[PDB]
Design a protein around this ligand. Structure first.
Ligand SMILES: O=C(O)CCC(=O)C(=O)O
Ligand SMILES: [Fe+2]
Length: 323
């Protein structure tokens, strides 16, 4: 689903100007300011966000286009490293992630990931691991983000400050609401609520005492007629023949309903991380200081088990595997 936000530029530049200029120095206060300001989002944008939050969509994403972004010459050099400096001045697309994110829920960091920070720069780096956001020339395969984590976030949000030079990197999304009807009833029933072994991403590795301790992911779960999805092409590891066959049918169906989005400066993509898998196609970095640059945050909501009380936007949570 898409919303053209161009006509909102003046109002959104104003809301961004309400926010602290050095977000990370007091991230709790920054995100509280963003929550207050989110009450003043333009009405039709607020409606689109609240509708998507409550209901999702058939295509599993909400793309906001034409948000105020700095001119390319007015941005810093694309980052080369992580974590970001705590003193880094606010970027307009970060302000947008604050406002839009707090309209939806609570920004969440993961202790073991990206030094326990909340805002993540997504840029290409040489020598990237094949599952990393740092990849460029190799396809980043379909994944639900952190499907294996008990505190998996409801949304992944990606805001673009720079696209890659040739605008060849496409962000791919595949929605369970489009894939499910392509599956037959026997496949749906095998997948639904069935725990399967799932490896974890690099950041979360170690301390796995025995095969008992391996994370368990239900590739479909919840209401049989409108299930949630948990899928990771590389990390999900079904063991019985009937499980491998059912996951292969799911994989095929997700490919057949793939949608491609080319993120450009000013775009903010909201992925329904309980109903959709995402991926990124190849591109060739130039190592020139102007490579592709996204900002990523994770948002928790009241849906399903994410929150148990007292959480704040900006909290950083520890790892517990699903079981
Ligand atoms: O680079 C992209 O478009 C998406 C990368 C991604 O999967 C993520 O940052 O979670
Ligand atoms: Fe991702």
């Amino acid at each position: 689903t898409s919303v053209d936000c161009t006509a909102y530029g003046p109002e959104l530049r104003a809301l961004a100007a309400r926010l602290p200029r050095t977000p990370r120095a007091d991230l709790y206060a920054f995100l509280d300011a963003a929550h207050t300001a989110a009450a003043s989002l333009p009405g039709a944008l607020a409606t689109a966000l609240d509708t998507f939050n409550a209901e999702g969509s058939e295509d599993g994403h909400l793309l906001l286009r034409g948000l105020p972004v700095e001119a390319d010459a007015d941005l810093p050099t694309t980052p080369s490293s992580t974590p970001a400096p705590e003193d880094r001045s606010l970027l307009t697309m970060e302000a947008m992630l604050g406002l839009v994110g707090r309209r939806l829920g609570l920004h969440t960091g993961y202790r073991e990931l990206r030094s326990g920070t909340v805002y993540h720069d997504v840029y290409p780096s040489p020598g990237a691991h094949h599952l990393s956001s740092e990849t460029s020339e190799t396809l980043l395969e379909f994944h639900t983000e952190m499907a294996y984590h008990r505190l998996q976030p409801n949304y992944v949000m990606l805001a673009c400050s720079r696209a890659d030079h040739e605008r060849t990197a496409a962000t791919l999304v595949a929605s369970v609401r489009k894939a499910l009807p392509l599956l037959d009833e026997r496949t749906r029933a095998r997948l639904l609520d069935r725990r399967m072994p799932c490896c974890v991403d690099v950041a979360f590795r170690g301390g796995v005492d025995d095969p008992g301790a391996i994370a368990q992911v239900k590739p479909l779960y919840g209401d049989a007629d409108d299930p949630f999805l948990g899928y990771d092409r590389e990390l999900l590891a079904p063991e019985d023949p009937a499980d491998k066959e059912a996951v292969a049918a799911l994989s095929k169906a997700l490919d057949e309903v793939t949608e491609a989005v080319y993120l450009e400066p000013g775009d903010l993509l909201i992925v329904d991380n309980f109903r959709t898998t995402h991926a990124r196609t190849p591109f060739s970095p130039r190592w020139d200081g102007k490579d592709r640059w996204l900002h990523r945050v994770y948002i928790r909501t009241d849906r399903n088990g994410q929150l148990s009380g007292g959480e704040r936007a900006g909290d950083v949570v520890a790892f517990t595997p699903r079981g």
